[PDB]
Scaffold this active site. Structure first.
Site, PDB file in Angstrom:
ATOM      1  N   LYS A  41      -4.553   0.968  11.413  1.00 23.64           N
ATOM      2  CA  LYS A  41      -5.336   0.010  12.249  1.00 23.64           C
ATOM      3  C   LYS A  41      -4.701  -1.377  12.156  1.00 23.64           C
ATOM      4  O   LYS A  41      -4.744  -2.154  13.091  1.00 23.64           O
ATOM      5  CB  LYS A  41      -6.777  -0.051  11.740  1.00 23.64           C
ATOM      6  CG  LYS A  41      -7.494   1.259  12.076  1.00 23.64           C
ATOM      7  CD  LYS A  41      -8.156   1.142  13.450  1.00 23.64           C
ATOM      8  CE  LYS A  41      -9.001   2.389  13.717  1.00 23.64           C
ATOM      9  NZ  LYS A  41      -8.140   3.455  14.304  1.00 23.64           N
ATOM     10  N   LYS A  66       0.237  -1.270   4.227  1.00 20.89           N
ATOM     11  CA  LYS A  66       0.231  -0.011   3.423  1.00 20.89           C
ATOM     12  C   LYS A  66       0.742  -0.300   2.009  1.00 20.89           C
ATOM     13  O   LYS A  66       0.254   0.253   1.041  1.00 20.89           O
ATOM     14  CB  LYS A  66       1.139   1.024   4.092  1.00 20.89           C
ATOM     15  CG  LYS A  66       0.701   2.430   3.679  1.00 20.89           C
ATOM     16  CD  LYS A  66       1.599   3.464   4.360  1.00 20.89           C
ATOM     17  CE  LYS A  66       2.924   3.569   3.603  1.00 20.89           C
ATOM     18  NZ  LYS A  66       3.940   4.232   4.469  1.00 20.89           N
ATOM     19  N   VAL A 123      -4.936   0.077   0.163  1.00 21.09           N
ATOM     20  CA  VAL A 123      -4.841   0.487   1.595  1.00 21.09           C
ATOM     21  C   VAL A 123      -4.032   1.781   1.700  1.00 21.09           C
ATOM     22  O   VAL A 123      -3.027   1.950   1.038  1.00 21.09           O
ATOM     23  CB  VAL A 123      -4.145  -0.614   2.398  1.00 21.09           C
ATOM     24  CG1 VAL A 123      -4.194  -0.269   3.886  1.00 21.09           C
ATOM     25  CG2 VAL A 123      -4.859  -1.947   2.161  1.00 21.09           C
ATOM     26  N   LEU A 126       0.178  -2.681   0.238  1.00 18.56           N
ATOM     27  CA  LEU A 126      -0.930  -3.278  -0.563  1.00 18.56           C
ATOM     28  C   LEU A 126      -1.628  -2.176  -1.382  1.00 18.56           C
ATOM     29  O   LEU A 126      -1.732  -1.054  -0.924  1.00 18.56           O
ATOM     30  CB  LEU A 126      -1.946  -3.930   0.379  1.00 18.56           C
ATOM     31  CG  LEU A 126      -1.257  -5.002   1.229  1.00 18.56           C
ATOM     32  CD1 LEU A 126      -2.255  -5.569   2.241  1.00 18.56           C
ATOM     33  CD2 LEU A 126      -0.755  -6.132   0.326  1.00 18.56           C
TER      34      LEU A 126
END
EC number: 2.7.7.7
Length: 86
Positions: free
Chosen positions: A71, A59, A64, A61
């Site tokens: 996932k 997350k 994203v 990143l």
């Protein structure tokens, strides 16, 4: 500045599952929102200079969100499951 890292096996297995289903998004009619989902998460995780061991690491990143990052946690958690446990 022209980096081009060396070929290595770090997180090239996840992106293979995000790039594959990603085609299923655009290839489908009403699936353009989820398309960018794996399109960005597959590019950042496929070109990341480090490894991850939790959905939170995906997350942080840039690109994203919580859906795709969720996932990722299932990847580092176990990998696959049929029923739930209690």
């Amino acid at each position: 500045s022209k980096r081009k890292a060396p070929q290595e096996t770090l997180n090239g297995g996840i992106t293979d599952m995000l790039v594959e289903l990603a085609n299923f998004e655009k290839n489908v009619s009403q699936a353009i929102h989820k398309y960018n989902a794996y399109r960005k998460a597959a590019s950042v995780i496929a070109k990341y200079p480090h490894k991850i061991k939790s959905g939170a690491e995906a997350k942080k990143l840039p690109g994203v969100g919580t859906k795709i990052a969720e996932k990722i946690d299932e990847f580092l958690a176990t990998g696959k499951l049929r029923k739930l446990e209690k």
